[PDB]
């Protein structure tokens, strides 16, 4: 809505808010990111450190699919199965532990942030972090790898 903007309030005011002395001129200071190493150096250094220069090795023909490895933490691990699955295992008399296939849920690597409920579980993943494996074995579970 143009009726809600400053232009409707700047009618009758000669400089339209831009000022009498400095005026409103086309491009004082340059166009775009002009003078980032010259007359705009302080802004670029103050707010965008690292902007200028090369770092690291380039890699031609990067294929993002090859590096595809979504991760899930242990605190969210039991959300990949139904609530029926986890209550049944807890009240199960035997040592039967449910299987959580994180690849089926869309994750490849299991990370170890958080803590697990005290009940065994079999976790199937492409990759495991060291601490995720340790926490799964602490609750009596097992980690088995898939390809």
């Amino acid at each position: 809505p143009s009726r809600l903007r400053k232009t409707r309030k700047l009618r009758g005011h000669v400089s339209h808010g831009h000022g009498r002395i400095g005026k409103h001129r086309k491009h004082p200071g340059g166009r775009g990111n002009a003078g980032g190493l010259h007359h705009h150096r302080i802004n670029f250094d103050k707010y965008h450190p690292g902007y200028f220069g090369k770092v690291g090795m380039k890699h031609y023909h990067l294929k993002r699919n090859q590096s595809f490895c979504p991760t899930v933490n242990l605190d969210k691990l039991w959300t990949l199965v139904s609530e029926q699955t986890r209550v049944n295992a807890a009240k199960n008399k035997t040592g039967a532990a449910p299987i959580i296939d994180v690849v089926r849920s869309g994750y490849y690597k299991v990370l170890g942030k958080g803590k697990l409920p005290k009940q065994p579980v079999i976790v199937k993943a492409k990759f495991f972090s060291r601490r995720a494996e340790e926490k799964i074995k602490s609750v009596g579970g097992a980690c088995v790898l898939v390809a």
Partner: protein, 187 residues
């Protein structure tokens, strides 16, 4: 003429909700009366929170509410939050909770009720505790927002750990001069 400064005369504060939510306006009317006609400072705090913007009324996760409710001496007290209560899927055991909130997520509401809990709105809280007696007034993390990572000292200043605004994250995006000693300076 008198020698004073007039730049601080008008205190900048919410005197009403900028929302046009008629249900929020109704319970603002209810708590405007309660704050005026009672000596309860609880009603004053609740009333001024009702004016607040959404960013000033952050959501309260179920885990945070449970953790504050589990502190000693808070048994059989009502958890009051002027905002949204959110399910936390990181918790596995929900205890019995008496809860008043402006708004409760459907999954969080089902979990609280299934655990034998009780959910109140602010109109029902007024009838239950008009002065707010036996309540625990909670708040979500006010600085739990992405904007606050960018606030503070400028990123290109020494001993500043504030997130810069970058369109992309990668080795080519603002990781060179001014970020490492090899590339001019680091600070």
């Amino acid at each position: 003429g008198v020698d004073i400064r007039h730049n601080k005369d008008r205190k900048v504060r919410r005197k009403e909700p900028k929302s046009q939510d008629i249900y929020l306006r109704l319970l603002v009317k209810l708590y405007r009366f309660l704050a005026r006609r009672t000596n309860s400072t609880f009603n004053q705090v609740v009333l001024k929170r009702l004016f607040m913007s959404r960013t000033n009324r952050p959501p309260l996760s179920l885990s945070r509410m449970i953790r504050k409710m589990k502190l000693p001496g808070r048994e059989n007290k009502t958890a009051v939050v002027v905002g949204t209560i959110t399910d936390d899927v990181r918790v596995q055991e929900v205890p019995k909770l008496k809860v008043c909130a402006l708004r409760v997520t459907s999954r969080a509401r089902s979990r609280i009720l299934r655990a034998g809990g009780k959910i109140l709105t602010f109109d029902q809280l007024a009838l239950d505790s008009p002065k707010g007696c036996g309540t625990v007034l909670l708040s979500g993390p006010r600085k739990g927002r992405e904007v606050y990572r960018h606030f503070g000292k400028a990123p290109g200043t020494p001993h500043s750990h504030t997130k810069p605004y970058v369109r992309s994250k990668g080795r080519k995006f603002e990781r060179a001069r001014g970020r490492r000693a090899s590339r001019g300076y680091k600070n």
